Amino acid sequence: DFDHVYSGVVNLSTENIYSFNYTSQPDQVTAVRVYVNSSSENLNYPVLVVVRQQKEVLSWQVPLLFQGLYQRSYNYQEVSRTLCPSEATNETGPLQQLIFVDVASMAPLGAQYKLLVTKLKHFQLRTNVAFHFTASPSQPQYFLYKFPKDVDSVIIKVVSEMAYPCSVVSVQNIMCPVYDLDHNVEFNGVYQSMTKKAAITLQKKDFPGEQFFVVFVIKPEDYACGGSFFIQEKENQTWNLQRKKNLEVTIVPS
Amino acid sequence: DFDHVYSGVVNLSTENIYSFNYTSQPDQVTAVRVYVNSSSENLNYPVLVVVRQQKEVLSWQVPLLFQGLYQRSYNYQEVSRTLCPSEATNETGPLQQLIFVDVASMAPLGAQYKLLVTKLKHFQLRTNVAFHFTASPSQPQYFLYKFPKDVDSVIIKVVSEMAYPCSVVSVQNIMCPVYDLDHNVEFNGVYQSMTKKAAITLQKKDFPGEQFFVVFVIKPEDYACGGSFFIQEKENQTWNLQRKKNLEVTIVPS
Numbered sequence A, B: 001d002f003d004h005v006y007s008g009v010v011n012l013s014t015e016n017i018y019s020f021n022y023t024s025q026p027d028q029v030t031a032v033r034v035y036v037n038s039s040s041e042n043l044n045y046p047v048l049v050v051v052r053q054q055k056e057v058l059s060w061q062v063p064l065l066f067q068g069l070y071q072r073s074y075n076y077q078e079v080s081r082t083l084c085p086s087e088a089t090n091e092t093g094p095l096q097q098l099i100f101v102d103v104a105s106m107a108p109l110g111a112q113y114k115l116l117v118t119k120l121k122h123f124q125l126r127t128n129v130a131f132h133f134t135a136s137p138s139q140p141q142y143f144l145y146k147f148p149k150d151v152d153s154v155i156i157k158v159v160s161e162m163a164y165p166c167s168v169v170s171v172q173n174i175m176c177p178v179y180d181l182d183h184n185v186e187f188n189g190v191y192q193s194m195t196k197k198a199a200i201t202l203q204k205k206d207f208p209g210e211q212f213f214v215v216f217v218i219k220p221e222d223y224a225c226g227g228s229f230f231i232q233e234k235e236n237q238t239w240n241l242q243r244k245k246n247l248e249v250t251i252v253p254s
């Protein structure tokens, strides 16, 4: 059941399996959202969490580890990701899709974890309607925009209040898996880094499906955006664990 | 047990689990190699294969699907990958490491799969000793090179016979996971595309661990290397299923 937070313990011998079932009616897209965290401060035994779809498998390790420049390590405890939104057409049918969440680890004593699942109520961006959302290095986001019939070009405008952390806004076509990671978001489509403002101009003629994904991914450090670095004698920067950035996104017709 | 090919059937209700255990003595690196293939020609239900380590989880889908330019799809049946090589130091101990291989799917009838596991006998490249190996878009490779005490710079030279397919040779530091995919290999470290020849100059001063990984990844198409494209009316190019490239690698002291 969505909108519920399960709590559990993991260890070498026991793994937890939760099967979710849901339907997506035609002309409406429903993106699933997974909200995991683990309280294990240790890094030699991170808890692995996998989400399996009908076609795609996505796995990650918690607490997520980042290796910035100058060999500083970062340990993030809250991780989150959005799955491939299965698309339905005028070929109707209540597609009774299923999604597995499997958690396991090999910690000698174990590790705590809390897991929440929820469909994104606002997944399809609307024209000229400003939306507010909070991102984070380990909590990337993305939403689907569908072009209108009359409009032939759009400008997507993103505004933030606090300049740091550095962030990246990308636009890709609809062919999942969706590239929403710091080391991979740059491979495909358009993208740009930003602190306060960003704007991408898109034409429907370059997108055969007349609908595209917009992905927001926050960097772990701020070197690429000209930021500074707090020199700390501790390699594991436990202070950099709650990085967040408020964001407003609006798509205006060109 | 390594050097053995297991055969099995997968479906919605049944999954297969095989736990492997092995040890890596200090000053010797042992990289595990996973050799999977599936005979399911269908693409709406690919079989998912995951490999779980003590810290890292790596998952892929078979038959692997590639989306080149001009919306041509490719279906590769043989997939393979090398895991994170756990490193042991003068702090001795026969590290009795374990690695899980879990296979599952939801095909309405099922899908065949054959799985083989083996340690790489030649994983640490030797100076001035030429090595021969066969790569492929879905079968990437990588090996570890360790700098000598006297030598301070090296040149790695790669030579192939057949110009196509296009390939990429990358060098990264030792901090796994190792970036050995077409959309990600370009993120970190040095790399270059090639058809027949390539050469990377490296200094030990830029590598704190005085040892680096060398990754060979073959592209699915040849557009980036100036190759042509066989125009076919079939979107699923079943002919492009056995792409291979013989390769010779030699590290000379600068």
Ligand SMILES: *[C@@H]1O[C@H](CO)[C@@H](O)[C@H](O)[C@H]1NC(C)=O
Pocket: A020, A021, A022, A096, A097, A098
């Ligand atoms: C979802 O699908 C599974 C198997 O496909 C089934 O066992 C389960 O009952 C379904 N959920 C609902 C609410 O019917």
Ligand SMILES: *[C@@H]1O[C@H](CO)[C@@H](O)[C@H](O)[C@H]1NC(C)=O
Pocket: A005, A035, A036, A037, A039, A114, A115, A116
């Ligand atoms: C973990 O996340 C859940 C919801 O995602 C939240 O209720 C809980 O407080 C979080 N735990 C910690 C320790 O932050």
Ligand SMILES: *[C@@H]1O[C@H](CO)[C@@H](O)[C@H](O)[C@H]1NC(C)=O
Pocket: A026, A027, A090
């Ligand atoms: C068929 O497609 C059109 C345009 O995409 C849409 O307006 C209409 O609602 C669809 N029909 C049904 C029954 O959903």
Ligand SMILES: *[C@@H]1O[C@H](CO)[C@@H](O)[C@H](O)[C@H]1NC(C)=O
Pocket: B020, B021, B022, B096, B097, B098
């Ligand atoms: C490998 O480790 C597992 C559990 O850690 C153990 O059950 C198994 O016996 C080990 N393998 C060997 C050959 O001892």
Ligand SMILES: *[C@@H]1O[C@H](CO)[C@@H](O)[C@H](O)[C@H]1NC(C)=O
Pocket: B005, B035, B036, B037, B039, B114, B115, B116
């Ligand atoms: C699958 O791979 C195994 C070894 O990796 C090999 O023996 C077998 O012939 C392969 N099957 C097919 C259909 O290629």
Ligand SMILES: *[C@@H]1O[C@H](CO)[C@@H](O)[C@H](O)[C@H]1NC(C)=O
Pocket: B026, B027, B090
């Ligand atoms: C200790 O390290 C040195 C250099 O790395 C190596 O030659 C030696 O064999 C190591 N000692 C043991 C007991 O492995």
